[PDB]
Amino acid sequence: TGFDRGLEAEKILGASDNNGRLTFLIQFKGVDQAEMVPSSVANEKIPRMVIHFYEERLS
Amino acid sequence: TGFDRGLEAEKILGASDNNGRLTFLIQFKGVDQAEMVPSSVANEKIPRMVIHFYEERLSWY
């Protein structure tokens, strides 16, 4: 919903799977508190950042 | 890669890291033998299928 407000995602701070439903914790530029975003929104809005997160967490 | 020849990715069969370098094994439609593709190509061409592969890999690992 920082996406709704047209903010710029800076990084994905974490991912949490709740019974098959994935949520990301996303740090937005110019916003102090990180925001919980469902994977359904993140996959669409910031796919390169999602892939890089998974790629790096491949460790 | 198979992407250069107009082929369509059917399924990502696996991923291999070689010193920070990730390569995917990709099943292409109508081609029996799956082929290795650098992540840099797969990320650009088939990001929905890349993401889905990671969602599932990680749900089971």
Curated annotation (Swiss-Prot), chain A:
Salivary gland (at protein level). It is found in: Nucleus; Nucleus, Nucleoplasm; Chromosome; Chromosome, Telomere. Coiled coil: none annotated. It comes from the Eukaryota. Residues 7-59 form the Chromo domain. Homodimer. Probably associates with Su(var)3-9. Interacts with Mcm10. Interacts (via chromoshadow domain) with piwi (via N-terminal region). Interacts with Rrp6. Associates with and may be part of the HipHop-HOAP telomere capping complex but is not required for its stability or telomere localization. Interacts (via the chromo domain 2 (chromoshadow domain) and the hinge region between chromo domains 1 and 2) with cav/HOAP (via C-terminus); the interaction is direct. Each molecule of cav/HOAP interacts with 2 molecules of Su(var)205/HP1. Interacts with HipHop (via N-terminus). Structural component of heterochromatin, involved in gene repression and the modification of position-effect-variegation. Recognizes and binds histone H3 tails methylated at 'Lys-9', leading to epigenetic repression. Stabilizes chromatin-associated RNAs probably by binding to them and thereby preventing their degradation. Associates with, and may be a part of, the HipHop-HOAP complex that recruits the MTV complex to form the terminin telomere-capping complex, which binds to chromosome ends in a sequence-independent manner and prevents telomere fusion. This is Heterochromatin protein 1. It comes from Drosophila melanogaster. The chain holds residues 141 to 199 of 206 of the full protein.
